[PDB]
Amino acid sequence: MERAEILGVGTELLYGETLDTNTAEIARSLKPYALKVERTLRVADEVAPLAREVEEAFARARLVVLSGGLGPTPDDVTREAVALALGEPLELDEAVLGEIEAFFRARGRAMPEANRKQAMRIPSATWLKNPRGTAPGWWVRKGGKDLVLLPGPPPEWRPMWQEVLPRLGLPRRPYAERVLKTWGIGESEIVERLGPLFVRGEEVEVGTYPKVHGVEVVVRGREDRVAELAERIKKKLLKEVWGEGEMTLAEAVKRRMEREGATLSTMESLTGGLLGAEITRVPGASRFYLGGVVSYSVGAKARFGVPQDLLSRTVSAETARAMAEAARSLFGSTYALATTGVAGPDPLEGEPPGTVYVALAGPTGAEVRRYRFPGDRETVRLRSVYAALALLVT
Amino acid sequence: MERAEILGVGTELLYGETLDTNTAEIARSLKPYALKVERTLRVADEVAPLAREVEEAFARARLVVLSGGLGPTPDDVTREAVALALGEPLELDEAVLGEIEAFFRARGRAMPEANRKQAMRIPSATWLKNPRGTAPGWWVRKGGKDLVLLPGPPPEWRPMWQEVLPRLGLPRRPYAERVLKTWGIGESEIVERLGPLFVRGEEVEVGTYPKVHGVEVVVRGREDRVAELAERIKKKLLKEVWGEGEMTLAEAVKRRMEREGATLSTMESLTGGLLGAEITRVPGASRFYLGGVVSYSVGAKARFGVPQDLLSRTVSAETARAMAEAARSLFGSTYALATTGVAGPDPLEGEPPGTVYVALAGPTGAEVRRYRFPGDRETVRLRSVYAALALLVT
Ligand SMILES: Nc1ncnc2c1ncn2[C@@H]1O[C@H](COP(=O)(O)OP(=O)(O)OC[C@H]2O[C@@H](O)[C@H](O)[C@@H]2O)[C@@H](O)[C@H]1O
Ligand SMILES: Nc1ncnc2c1ncn2[C@@H]1O[C@H](COP(=O)(O)OP(=O)(O)OC[C@H]2O[C@@H](O)[C@H](O)[C@@H]2O)[C@@H](O)[C@H]1O
Ligand SMILES: [Mg+2]
Ligand SMILES: [Mg+2]
């Protein structure tokens, strides 16, 4: 098995000022291909060391993938280092320069001189278009080997990588991963519910991964084994599984609302807006989500329809019900969600951080669910958002 | 300046099954010393590739540090790789083996035979005690160079490292770093404004880090050189610096509101609640943040005060101003922020994705800023949140 080598470029990655997730994500994407990943590197933004590491990775590898340092600044040296490592001159491509200039023109700016180096390439490179930023990537095919340069930000490189990857002509191997997403059941109860299905052979293996949106059950390995094992696991957890793969609670809610021709609105306290944020993260949200209130003060709560009598007891089922009913009446939506409780770090009304009520008001009345969540302030806010969503799709 | 090499060992680190914080944490611990970290590696649990990387690392470095693979399983091969890489045989230390047998006896168990190999070390190694786990570390002094082996778990290695590090006799250099957080200036303008200040020497260097919350400018290296160069730099960027170090936009906004005794509300369209969520992320936000509305439907935009005549150009500076003025009136807050625009993927009102207006209303009036953000839907939404917060801290 030939090697894939994967280098994250950036001094800030060495120190973990940002944690390098790119090399790992790229390693994971390579699992359906018959390439060995023996190591990954993070490399400082310095031309001579980077060139040395690139030259060495390329010598030993079928595929070398770099991310980062394609920007316009003196700390962005990946293109100069790669051209040094491959023994090729960097050449300005006028057409790409024109494209960057147009990108700045559209935004009402003249292109600064520093951007020019983003349009440089070596003879062996073809361009990988980047509609999400100013630095296009490179794909170098040379001597039967591939070297791919990607911009550092994941929102920019992910769809570039996704497109180039099948074009590389890499040898395949039958791998698959199936992600089964559950809610309201702990790791232990899942293991025990599965029993012999909880396989950990080298052909195929099952794992449990607790997340803020519930425990994932992940099946990975040889594609045939994954498909069959995942089917059987899915049956054992049929009541707990709310979606798979790319499905999210926010998208499942969207599917339900569009199936019913229904609308949704929200009123939030401790989640601060994060619930409306999560609903609207999914394209098409405006077809059903009418909007929401962030009632983060007594005055706002009263103004938008929560009864005076409840205002001094916010950590309660009665409050979560009244807020969902207030939202529904204010927006006239088919359904409304509410969140109230203690995020942390301080207790509130004698209740510890993590004490949360979420409520759903619909045509047939209201329901409330109480949780006691583990985690710091941000984690409790997150789990509260997924718990309110779960009211509609679990 | 000589090199320090840092290798995290473990196949799971390559794929992100375990997130490699060890290598970065060790690199940060080395900042007080005159050593260059050019790269960090993560390496698979295989004895041949691991020994090759250790050999290469040791050859080029004054210091090598490894973590992980000190366990008792067949996949724990770090001791074997180091011995191989350094051309020395492993030797059983009978006293350490008795300590391991004590560890298992201390918990009512015989020592499994697999744990025997944890008492092996090479002649050039002294032991590093581990009172938290069974694997002692190594300190190898050889050829005026140091190589340290540490166990994978942070609670085990952290005290071990802190104890051995000041014994290694590493050359010290007075280190400092300064992080300047900017908004509303791109990397190229920064390059041009700074010009020759954008130093990249061995004693001191300047870097930029483009984030969704704006460009961070980092100066790091010799203590006297960093203070002067960062002061000059901050003076060149005075209008655009809104914070330093650990400061965040949400915290900066909190500071201003507490300084003035002022309150804040929001009205959001495209950001969907994300702006409220970012404001309330910081503990103590309830002292100034009254709440907000998410006016996602045209009906909600009209309900919360956007004038009828603007509902056909909700993506405009006039509407953003009207939304901020409405929120301010609706909540009776000192200030209000509003967001409106085109998140993507589809255009809206003829305007392309990334077209965003943010506005601030206060006692002295309202103001609006327009942006054209490249990026996918989630990125446009995030940038808009920070753009709105930047109106209050410039
Ligand atoms: N290994 C990594 N893992 C996770 N995130 C990363 C990594 N490397 C970079 N990032 C993220 O990307 C950010 C920018 O990293 P750079 O290396 O500077 O990316 P660069 O390739 O130079 O491009 C920067 C910007 O310039 C534009 O022309 C280009 O389109 C991009 O918008 C980092 O601050 C970090 O948030
Ligand atoms: N680079 C890393 N970054 C962060 N955490 C890490 C890293 N490497 C390991 N860890 C953490 O430590 C855990 C164990 O990693 P191993 O490499 O297996 O640790 P190892 O040195 O082999 O020792 C494991 C156990 O065996 C004992 O004898 C030894 O004392 C330790 O208790 C990992 O699951 C992870 O939680
Ligand atoms: Mg860059
Ligand atoms: Mg181990």
GROMACS .gro file of C-alpha atoms in nm, chain A residues 131-358:
model
  228
  131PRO     CA    1  -1.559   3.046  -0.503
  132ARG     CA    2  -1.550   3.102  -0.125
  133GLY     CA    3  -1.234   3.313  -0.090
  134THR     CA    4  -0.949   3.465  -0.283
  135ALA     CA    5  -0.687   3.184  -0.288
  136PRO     CA    6  -0.740   2.916  -0.542
  137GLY     CA    7  -0.579   2.574  -0.467
  138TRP     CA    8  -0.337   2.362  -0.682
  139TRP     CA    9  -0.348   2.007  -0.807
  140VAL     CA   10   0.003   1.894  -0.921
  141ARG     CA   11   0.018   1.567  -1.117
  142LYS     CA   12   0.389   1.477  -1.154
  143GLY     CA   13   0.557   1.141  -1.207
  144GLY     CA   14   0.247   0.937  -1.133
  145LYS     CA   15   0.215   1.130  -0.800
  146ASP     CA   16  -0.044   1.384  -0.677
  147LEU     CA   17   0.018   1.689  -0.464
  148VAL     CA   18  -0.287   1.902  -0.369
  149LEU     CA   19  -0.271   2.247  -0.202
  150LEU     CA   20  -0.586   2.356  -0.011
  151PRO     CA   21  -0.675   2.687   0.163
  152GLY     CA   22  -0.667   2.655   0.546
  153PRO     CA   23  -1.032   2.740   0.635
  154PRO     CA   24  -1.251   2.422   0.632
  155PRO     CA   25  -1.553   2.612   0.474
  156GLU     CA   26  -1.330   2.690   0.181
  157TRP     CA   27  -1.133   2.364   0.130
  158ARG     CA   28  -1.401   2.109   0.209
  159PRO     CA   29  -1.594   2.141  -0.121
  160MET     CA   30  -1.266   2.186  -0.316
  161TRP     CA   31  -1.136   1.857  -0.171
  162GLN     CA   32  -1.463   1.678  -0.223
  163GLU     CA   33  -1.449   1.758  -0.594
  164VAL     CA   34  -1.082   1.684  -0.665
  165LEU     CA   35  -1.059   1.367  -0.455
  166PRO     CA   36  -1.233   1.122  -0.698
  167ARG     CA   37  -1.032   1.274  -0.987
  168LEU     CA   38  -0.701   1.166  -0.836
  169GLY     CA   39  -0.741   0.812  -0.968
  170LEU     CA   40  -0.647   0.661  -0.629
  171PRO     CA   41  -0.678   0.281  -0.579
  172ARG     CA   42  -1.009   0.201  -0.400
  173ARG     CA   43  -1.094  -0.032  -0.116
  174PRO     CA   44  -1.450  -0.113   0.010
  175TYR     CA   45  -1.487   0.100   0.329
  176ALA     CA   46  -1.802   0.248   0.468
  177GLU     CA   47  -1.915   0.434   0.784
  178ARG     CA   48  -2.279   0.441   0.901
  179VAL     CA   49  -2.372   0.691   1.175
  180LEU     CA   50  -2.692   0.612   1.366
  181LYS     CA   51  -2.810   0.910   1.579
  182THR     CA   52  -3.016   0.849   1.893
  183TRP     CA   53  -3.164   1.062   2.168
  184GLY     CA   54  -3.248   1.005   2.536
  185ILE     CA   55  -3.049   0.678   2.591
  186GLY     CA   56  -2.701   0.651   2.755
  187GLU     CA   57  -2.397   0.467   2.617
  188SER     CA   58  -2.436   0.180   2.872
  189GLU     CA   59  -2.795   0.115   2.790
  190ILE     CA   60  -2.703   0.108   2.419
  191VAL     CA   61  -2.415  -0.140   2.467
  192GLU     CA   62  -2.641  -0.365   2.677
  193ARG     CA   63  -2.938  -0.334   2.435
  194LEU     CA   64  -2.706  -0.446   2.149
  195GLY     CA   65  -2.497  -0.715   2.321
  196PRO     CA   66  -2.345  -0.944   2.057
  197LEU     CA   67  -2.410  -0.673   1.786
  198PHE     CA   68  -2.158  -0.449   1.962
  199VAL     CA   69  -1.880  -0.602   1.742
  200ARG     CA   70  -1.519  -0.505   1.761
  201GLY     CA   71  -1.348  -0.737   1.497
  202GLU     CA   72  -1.093  -0.591   1.252
  203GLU     CA   73  -1.329  -0.643   0.948
  204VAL     CA   74  -1.594  -0.413   1.111
  205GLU     CA   75  -1.641  -0.227   1.447
  206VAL     CA   76  -1.915  -0.053   1.643
  207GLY     CA   77  -1.856   0.253   1.868
  208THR     CA   78  -2.071   0.488   2.082
  209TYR     CA   79  -2.004   0.861   2.076
  210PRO     CA   80  -2.200   1.091   2.320
  211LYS     CA   81  -2.282   1.424   2.157
  212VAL     CA   82  -2.496   1.727   2.260
  213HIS     CA   83  -2.753   1.598   2.007
  214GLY     CA   84  -2.757   1.252   2.159
  215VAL     CA   85  -2.542   0.937   2.147
  216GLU     CA   86  -2.419   0.841   1.803
  217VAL     CA   87  -2.376   0.472   1.716
  218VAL     CA   88  -2.110   0.448   1.450
  219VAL     CA   89  -2.048   0.134   1.239
  220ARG     CA   90  -1.728   0.137   1.032
  221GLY     CA   91  -1.503  -0.096   0.826
  222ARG     CA   92  -1.555  -0.319   0.526
  223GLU     CA   93  -1.851  -0.193   0.336
  224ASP     CA   94  -2.052  -0.522   0.318
  225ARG     CA   95  -2.007  -0.584   0.694
  226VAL     CA   96  -2.101  -0.222   0.780
  227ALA     CA   97  -2.429  -0.237   0.580
  228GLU     CA   98  -2.557  -0.556   0.736
  229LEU     CA   99  -2.442  -0.491   1.090
  230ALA     CA  100  -2.588  -0.136   1.079
  231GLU     CA  101  -2.927  -0.274   0.966
  232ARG     CA  102  -2.951  -0.505   1.259
  233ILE     CA  103  -2.827  -0.240   1.510
  234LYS     CA  104  -3.086   0.001   1.368
  235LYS     CA  105  -3.357  -0.255   1.443
  236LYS     CA  106  -3.240  -0.301   1.806
  237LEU     CA  107  -3.258   0.079   1.860
  238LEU     CA  108  -3.556   0.143   1.633
  239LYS     CA  109  -3.734   0.354   1.899
  240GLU     CA  110  -3.425   0.563   1.982
  241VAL     CA  111  -3.284   0.634   1.631
  242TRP     CA  112  -3.408   0.968   1.493
  243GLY     CA  113  -3.186   0.995   1.183
  244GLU     CA  114  -2.860   0.885   1.010
  245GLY     CA  115  -2.556   1.018   0.825
  246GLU     CA  116  -2.599   1.385   0.748
  247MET     CA  117  -2.954   1.414   0.905
  248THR     CA  118  -2.978   1.667   1.194
  249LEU     CA  119  -3.261   1.735   1.435
  250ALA     CA  120  -3.309   2.081   1.265
  251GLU     CA  121  -3.353   1.914   0.926
  252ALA     CA  122  -3.587   1.647   1.070
  253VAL     CA  123  -3.802   1.932   1.211
  254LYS     CA  124  -3.801   2.098   0.867
  255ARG     CA  125  -3.918   1.767   0.708
  256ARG     CA  126  -4.207   1.738   0.956
  257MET     CA  127  -4.319   2.101   0.910
  258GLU     CA  128  -4.313   2.071   0.530
  259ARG     CA  129  -4.495   1.734   0.542
  260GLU     CA  130  -4.774   1.897   0.753
  261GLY     CA  131  -4.768   2.234   0.579
  262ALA     CA  132  -4.708   2.369   0.938
  263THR     CA  133  -4.526   2.670   1.075
  264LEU     CA  134  -4.300   2.710   1.385
  265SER     CA  135  -4.195   2.999   1.614
  266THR     CA  136  -3.981   3.007   1.936
  267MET     CA  137  -3.937   3.189   2.265
  268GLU     CA  138  -3.604   3.135   2.439
  269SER     CA  139  -3.445   3.240   2.768
  270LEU     CA  140  -3.118   3.057   2.859
  271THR     CA  141  -3.043   2.946   2.494
  272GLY     CA  142  -3.025   3.315   2.406
  273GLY     CA  143  -3.121   3.280   2.033
  274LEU     CA  144  -2.928   2.951   1.976
  275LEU     CA  145  -3.254   2.763   1.916
  276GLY     CA  146  -3.372   2.994   1.639
  277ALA     CA  147  -3.014   2.989   1.512
  278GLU     CA  148  -3.014   2.610   1.481
  279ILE     CA  149  -3.353   2.594   1.318
  280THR     CA  150  -3.248   2.855   1.056
  281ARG     CA  151  -2.910   2.694   0.992
  282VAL     CA  152  -3.093   2.461   0.741
  283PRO     CA  153  -3.169   2.613   0.390
  284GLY     CA  154  -3.541   2.646   0.331
  285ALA     CA  155  -3.614   2.741   0.692
  286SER     CA  156  -3.811   3.049   0.579
  287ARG     CA  157  -4.080   2.824   0.436
  288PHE     CA  158  -4.192   2.731   0.786
  289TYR     CA  159  -4.010   2.924   1.064
  290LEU     CA  160  -4.191   3.253   1.128
  291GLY     CA  161  -3.928   3.373   1.383
  292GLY     CA  162  -3.884   3.399   1.760
  293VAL     CA  163  -3.834   3.600   2.075
  294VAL     CA  164  -3.521   3.598   2.301
  295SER     CA  165  -3.693   3.689   2.632
  296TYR     CA  166  -3.376   3.751   2.830
  297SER     CA  167  -3.523   3.993   3.088
  298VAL     CA  168  -3.839   4.005   3.301
  299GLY     CA  169  -3.954   4.302   3.096
  300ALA     CA  170  -3.921   4.114   2.765
  301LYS     CA  171  -4.094   3.807   2.905
  302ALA     CA  172  -4.389   4.018   3.021
  303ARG     CA  173  -4.405   4.219   2.700
  304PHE     CA  174  -4.434   3.911   2.477
  305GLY     CA  175  -4.699   3.746   2.680
  306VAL     CA  176  -4.573   3.545   2.974
  307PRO     CA  177  -4.815   3.599   3.275
  308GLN     CA  178  -4.701   3.833   3.553
  309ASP     CA  179  -4.768   3.553   3.807
  310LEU     CA  180  -4.485   3.338   3.661
  311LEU     CA  181  -4.217   3.600   3.612
  312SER     CA  182  -4.028   3.546   3.938
  313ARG     CA  183  -4.020   3.163   3.888
  314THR     CA  184  -3.841   3.108   3.559
  315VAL     CA  185  -3.699   2.762   3.630
  316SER     CA  186  -4.025   2.573   3.604
  317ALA     CA  187  -4.243   2.359   3.377
  318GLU     CA  188  -4.519   2.623   3.416
  319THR     CA  189  -4.287   2.890   3.274
  320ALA     CA  190  -4.167   2.670   2.982
  321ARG     CA  191  -4.540   2.595   2.892
  322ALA     CA  192  -4.646   2.961   2.920
  323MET     CA  193  -4.352   3.076   2.700
  324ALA     CA  194  -4.434   2.820   2.426
  325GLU     CA  195  -4.805   2.928   2.435
  326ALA     CA  196  -4.699   3.298   2.430
  327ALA     CA  197  -4.478   3.241   2.123
  328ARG     CA  198  -4.747   3.044   1.939
  329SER     CA  199  -5.009   3.318   2.004
  330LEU     CA  200  -4.765   3.600   1.918
  331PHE     CA  201  -4.657   3.455   1.579
  332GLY     CA  202  -4.972   3.253   1.506
  333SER     CA  203  -4.757   2.947   1.421
  334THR     CA  204  -4.879   2.593   1.411
  335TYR     CA  205  -4.624   2.491   1.675
  336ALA     CA  206  -4.395   2.680   1.911
  337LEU     CA  207  -4.090   2.577   2.113
  338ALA     CA  208  -3.958   2.728   2.438
  339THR     CA  209  -3.649   2.689   2.661
  340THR     CA  210  -3.600   2.806   3.018
  341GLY     CA  211  -3.361   2.698   3.303
  342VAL     CA  212  -3.013   2.732   3.445
  343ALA     CA  213  -2.718   2.740   3.199
  344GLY     CA  214  -2.448   2.792   3.462
  345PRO     CA  215  -2.210   2.885   3.604
  346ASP     CA  216  -2.445   3.010   3.882
  347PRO     CA  217  -2.739   2.837   4.036
  348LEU     CA  218  -3.076   3.008   3.987
  349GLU     CA  219  -3.387   2.995   4.220
  350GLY     CA  220  -3.217   2.715   4.419
  351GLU     CA  221  -3.165   2.499   4.105
  352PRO     CA  222  -2.812   2.397   3.984
  353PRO     CA  223  -2.674   2.458   3.631
  354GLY     CA  224  -2.820   2.206   3.381
  355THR     CA  225  -3.177   2.219   3.525
  356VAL     CA  226  -3.371   2.288   3.200
  357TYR     CA  227  -3.735   2.275   3.089
  358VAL     CA  228  -3.821   2.264   2.717
   0.00000   0.00000   0.00000
